[PDB]
Symmetry: D2
Subunit: 466 residues, 4 copies
């Protein structure tokens, strides 16, 4: 734990109230060249619900896949201390690869002026992956032990020690329309709600599917005595949907198209619409425009969290880091080749860059690891961060009128999660932000701010000029 | 390209800028158990930034005839005269690619729809461009720079030919040669030394006279070229480390004595360094090795002369550190990092532990003639230590303050840490390193200087209602 | 030069006559397991025309491409000693990358028993690349200097020193049918014979095209006072052709389809048919079935050399070497990934192989170089070897009837060149042979044999048992 | 799987095969200028191949408790008992992958339509399978093989558990420990040594008695297990080279003396070697280092005992050599070859010159636990030196001959050169190396043995009319 001697924070009824001065700057560029930078300010009073649910309910769509199954296993492994045998000895479970669970943040310096970091989840209170209550859907009924089997991600022994328990977790029938599977459809569709009472699939009753899914969420909520719940798409990858004026452009139409069983309405569209109606945060972990404007509207209306559009591969991450550092130092990357072979894949991206005076630079990144062992911890983080956000709200403080604010909620598309997605969906007029490093500080500073610490600046003036 | 920020923390006398900045930080004290107590600290300053930048800057390179050196001189003339050159891939315009000061940009703020607005790194305040450099220097080998550029087979053939007329005119000054000190990094023979005895043969006797010639040398260069501001940078061999002792190189009085006693522990490096200090020309040691022993540092603190320190980041070590960092910022536990090193080639193998017995292996293979990397880095280094020389700071206590009298940066330019592998320092402070962070320093200091907050990445305008 | 004290070789009228005992073995496999190996023998009298043309005429189709232009330049560079300046100093021309010009062969041992090799072209007399007289076609009229320019393969300076001369080499109009360009069509078709007298291309007059091409070869032959000529396809890569019963299955039909301007008749088909009619060796350096059965028939009839089906990339070569060595040692390659970005390309093939006891082996090959600098010397070799073959003929000697042989010519599809092609076309009932190493020895032994030396055996008994 | 070639160069007495072979070769003498004069040479032999192969072969490993050793013993039992094991990728049948004798094939001839016919490498003649091995050995560490296999974290966990009952029963014999000789390769402490003085502490005194215990040890193993044929292979540490001198290890008389004088230059290796010779058991040195000094070689020539020599090819050095060779067989001029080396990882960078100033860069990155590579290689080594032990040759002069009396192979099994990085030899002959070639030797010798020509790749049946 950490606590800061500051006057900008007061603990109410198990609620942190923080005043933050939001400095920024507007700049215009003159039809000549010159940039005119007009600074900016806007104080805020942030309210952090200080009580983390004791048990967070999670509902994975594609719960039978490599990521879903290893997610459940990672929770069971850590919660129950189930150590497993390995070719390299006996090993304790952990959560390596997770930012919430294993990375740290700088708090400040010490007597001698040397940096001092603390667990990324030590500052403010966050829910533990170990307190996750998972279940979900999957268009295939294998159970999670059998799921762990076909994925071949975990160690034989480990898989064995979780068998008894994971043979018990059974995914619910999901909704499966055939024309939308654009890929990542490893298993057969033998567990579906959507069956014309004869036995077939069919794309009819799309609204009834939505209701079924909504009811699903409600029942799951009670069977576990859970208040907060969070759904997340980790299934196959579908075909993008053609947003057309009248079907999925505005709220009114989206819902409407569903009842009509419009064809542009896809499985994820429903799970998303359902999640939203139940006011439960929905995360799109796969590439695809499930979040058409129409659905987005709905979210804005219900005032319920959404995020997503691809889990950030540990390769598409490392590609960002590398390419940025490059431009940041003045090199002009002029070419970018590729590789890529779930579990145990090989990635290789090569950069042919320009140096000064006709020179060139050839950089090659070779990457091998089991995908899911990276995608899973990253899923843990998303869930853990959209949980914390859901408990934060802010207030716009007017400098010449004490206490002029009615506490509001994070604009719906939590862009704060971007660090973990490839295509950061975004508010209507903004250009998305990538660049792992920037995306992380944003999060680090947000957390600094809530406990009253300033934006990290690294100027370290207590040495650069004594 | 110019930048004008509408603030009030900035007052412009005339060719003298005063800026008010509030340095927020924190001290923490974890104690008994796992609880960190942070006490935020503030300390106000007023930064004076002398707006007058030298129209011509003198750059004196030790190792002028080597790979870095010849290509430095080459890129100056080539960029300055827009001398295009032919290649198999077509005609090519010279540039300064690989220079942070010259080719990278910065985010100042946003615009009408939220999208960031970037601007040239050298646009903000006012900096000396490399095109207006005038360079000379020393080297233990007399070959002029057409030949040197010829040896250092780094530049395209045609380009070396369009530059032959001008580069031939440049010849390094005789240097100081103490054979036992040359650990490594000398690809060329020594036929240009000032330390010749009363018989013409390389001596280690008379080091103080060697020190004087270097000053005479520094003085002459400024005189013969107008130039008032001049900076020396060692880019020569890498000598064998010197052993730090008492009564020799510990103080500022017996380092001057030691030199006079022709005592050992005084490497060519030491002399050049001290000579640079004694003339108020900041000195940059771009190669690994002590040099900046304790004694020397004093001499520079006194006299008020800046000094940048120890070695200069490779374009793979400045990629190793960021690759490793990225990993550790995602919760991955590197277990092993192995490094190749060699156009030349570098390889780094990272085996880091994943979750539940899983493992990940990343392989970074890097290829390029690193002088095209080291050179733009040398420029940056020079431009930046120049800027830092027109900036004095004022430590203010808001309810009194420091009743006027600015201070130059603590001699050691630990701002230049983005360009040196072994960031020099002053006692007790654990060296930093952290490219991303280190660069974030220069951006923030370039910002506050003109009244800018120091960037956060919260985008409340977008994430907040 | 080399000369061997042996009784199996006699020099006639500037003609080597060699007796060779061709040992081999037939084996059947019993419906049980056992292999019954019935050895074999068949003596031969080989006749080698000992006089190499003073000037060999070469006609490249795609003479304007990266390979064609750098081929001409490599000949001009070496013949005229034109040294060029480089970033690394002044360099003399050479023929690195060529087996005929730069590799060696073991002849035998010495006083102390240490191996002794000799230039691969020192044994018997072969024509020098420096004595090549090149010209050819290209569906684009840039001249070869301009050709050298757009390819960017050679050093600026070198390109400059060959400018005067190469601005003089101008490719002839070629035949260009649009529907056959499946790829590698970097330049525009502005130099074609096939133009309906109006100005367009059209696919009519296919036979007249053949005649034009034949006449082309004849004129080239005389304008240079050349006897021997060799055409080679080094142009774009076309669409495979559908061999159908009646158009290109037998000779009679092929020729026929041409007159008919059948659509299955493609540009390479004609250059090939023409080459054959003129009895000049035709080499197919690109992937594509230009050699349909019908064309093959024709070759068999005229008794004229053919070979080809892709130039062997220095990567598809290195892939063979590696994969073989692997199986040869018992490893079971189970996977093979890929890369590939002419000039300056990057290849990367990765092998995931199985070791004993569930173990695995991960091998990755990364390759970067300018393609053409490898493809060109390899083109030199093909030309140099199909030239030598063209001067060899053999005789079947019957062991119980002195001198029963009428000297014959190499079966038409010189499979001896395979070492340099990817898809080694082959005689009707045989399964092609790859495996660079085997493919090379075959050539080494053939040459050994002609000068009377036995098949290399490496048993080195003068030490393994004294 | 059996092979029966219809020839007449092969006569089968009964469990004794005689083969007639004509060894064609050539001597050449380049002289004045560039002209090679080759004079073809012939020398006829009769090869006797004792058809009786041991039903059980004793394998004594020095270093039995190490990585190679435990996995050797493991693969024997696992293959022999068809003990399948579980993995994340499913249940897996044990095998002998990586063994040339066990899993690679050969071309004997063609068939009805020209297409080659391949057959198992161990099908031709008759060889001892690894499944019928009986292994014991020494190691300076007493840990039994369940534990050893446990340390050497090379085998899958489940597989180590299905083999725990049997591997626990096996414990290495006490070895010989001379601390100063251990250059490197000892990952484990020494708590199992026979060279303890009259007080129980490791001595270097009494080397001859150490030599005797090794024989007693060899004798016992054969007795206690029936076995008549037994082969020892050093797969222990790699010791510091020994210095060759006069009156100590030069002859066969003062190497026996030296040992008795407890003289130095006698490494544990030397003793094991000599002990193996003195019992007629062939000895295989699978690690770099002299050992096979000159003296020792004599002792083995005498006594008629085979000896395989120096180190054992890595699965990357046995890929470096072939990669380089391939390049040089295409006319490319390697200029630089750089080697990494580390499951473990290896990297090789080849920069070779192309035509007209062009350059090519090949990068070979290799990964795998190399014991799964070294182990099958050890098997092969053993199977093959066994075969070579049932083959005597007869040097015949066709118009007289050698009026009967075969000869064993010259002690040094330079046939095993495909498996050893530093192919040992006898004076004057420049070491060979050339994987492809070296393997082509074994194929040709396996061929002639049964009356086959020795393969050419001319395919006159296809290329000839
Ligand atoms: N960034 C990374 O490193 C990384 C790695 C692996 C997967 N991913 C992402 O995760 C997704 C797949 O994850 P995975 O590794 O478990 O793959 P997977 O191949 O196991 O597929 C996920 C599971 O989803 C189920 N599914 C498919 N369609 C469904 C539907 N309409 N409704 C409910 N369940 C459905 C499948 O049966 C399967 O078991 C992909 O979208 C992919 O982009 C990212
Ligand atoms: N660590 C890095 O990434 C990095 C990158 C670039 C340069 N450097 C530093 O730059 C220096 C040389 O680098 P380079 O690429 O130009 O190599 P280089 O091969 O051109 O050698 C430097 C030049 O200095 C001259 N010289 C040698 N000893 C001298 C002496 N005692 N006094 C004066 N001149 C001397 C040489 O003749 C040569 O021309 C070294 O100090 C090196 O450590 C380090
Ligand atoms: N193995 C290797 O490393 C390697 C490398 C490069 C090219 N190749 C082979 O060579 C061929 C192309 O060679 P390149 O490197 O010169 O490429 P390129 O891109 O320069 O194309 C060859 C030339 O052929 C000409 N051409 C195209 N179609 C023609 C036609 N119908 N008639 C006459 N000329 C025609 C083009 O205009 C071009 O200039 C391809 O088939 C390719 O497979 C192999
Ligand atoms: N060059 C190669 O590619 C290659 C490949 C495989 C093995 N080798 C050789 O095999 C040996 C070990 O290889 P490994 O992979 O099994 O390693 P390892 O780490 O298992 O060590 C060998 C074993 O020998 C034992 N040992 C050490 N010193 C000894 C001594 N003086 N007398 C008896 N036993 C002793 C050790 O305790 C250990 O169990 C070395 O000699 C090595 O050079 C070389």
């Amino acid at each position: 734990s950490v606590k800061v001697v500051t006057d900008k924070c007061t603990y109410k009824d198990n609620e942190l109230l923080t005043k933050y001065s939001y400095e920024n700057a507007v700049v215009t560029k003159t039809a000549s060249g010159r940039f005119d930078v007009t600074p900016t300010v806007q104080d805020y009073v942030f309210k952090l619900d200080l009580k983390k649910p004791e048990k967070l309910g999670i509902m994975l769509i594609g719960l039978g896949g490599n990521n879903g199954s290893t997610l459940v296993a990672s929770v069971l492994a850590n919660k129950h201390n189930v150590e497993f045998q390995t070719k390299e000895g006996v090993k304790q479970p952990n959560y390596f690869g997770s930012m919430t669970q294993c990375s740290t943040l700088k708090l400040g310096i010490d007597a001698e002026g040397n940096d001092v970091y603390a667990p990324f989840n030590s500052l403010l209170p966050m829910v533990s992956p170990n307190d996750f209550v998972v279940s979900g859907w999957d268009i295939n009924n294998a159970d999670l032990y059998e799921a762990m089997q076909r994925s071949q991600v975990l160690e034989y022994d480990l898989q064995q020690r979780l068998k008894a328990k994971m043979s018990l977790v059974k995914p619910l029938p999901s909704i499966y329309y055939p024309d939308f599977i654009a890929a990542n459809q490893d298993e057969r569709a033998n567990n579906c709600i959507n069956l014309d009472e004869k036995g077939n699939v069919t794309t009819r009753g799309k609204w009834t599917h939505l209701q079924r899914i909504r009811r699903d969420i409600q029942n799951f909520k009670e069977e576990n005595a859970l208040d907060k719940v969070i759904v997340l798409w980790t299934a196959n990858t579908e075909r993008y949907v053609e947003v057309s004026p009248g079907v999925n452009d505005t709220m009114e139409n989206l819902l409407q198209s569903i009842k009509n069983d419009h064809e542009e309405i896809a499985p994820s569209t429903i799970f998303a619409a359902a999640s939203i109606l139940e006011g439960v945060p929905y995360i799109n972990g796969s590439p695809q425009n499930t979040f058409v404007p129409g659905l987005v509207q709905l979210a804005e209306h219900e005032g319920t969290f959404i995020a997503g559009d691809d889990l950030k591969s540990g390769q598409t991450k490392l590609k960002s880091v590398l390419a940025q550092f490059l431009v940041d130092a003045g090199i002009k990357p002029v070419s970018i080749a590729s590789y890529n072979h779930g579990d145990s894949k090989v990635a290789m991206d090569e950069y042919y860059s320009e140096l000064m005076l006709g020179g060139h630079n050839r950089i090659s990144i070779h990457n091998v690891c089991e995908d899911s062992l990276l995608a899973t911890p990253l899923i843990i983080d998303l869930l853990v961060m959209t949980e914390f956000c859901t408990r934060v709200s802010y207030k716009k403080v007017d400098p010449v009128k004490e206490d002029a604010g009615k506490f509001e909620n994070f604009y719906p598309v939590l862009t704060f999660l971007s660090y973990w997605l490839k295509a950061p969906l975004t508010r209507p007029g903004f250009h998305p932000v990538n660049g792992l490093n920037k995306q992380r500080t944003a999060l680090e500073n947000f957390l600094r701010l809530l406990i009253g610490l300033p934006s990290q600046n690294e100027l370290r003036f207590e040495e650069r000029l004594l």
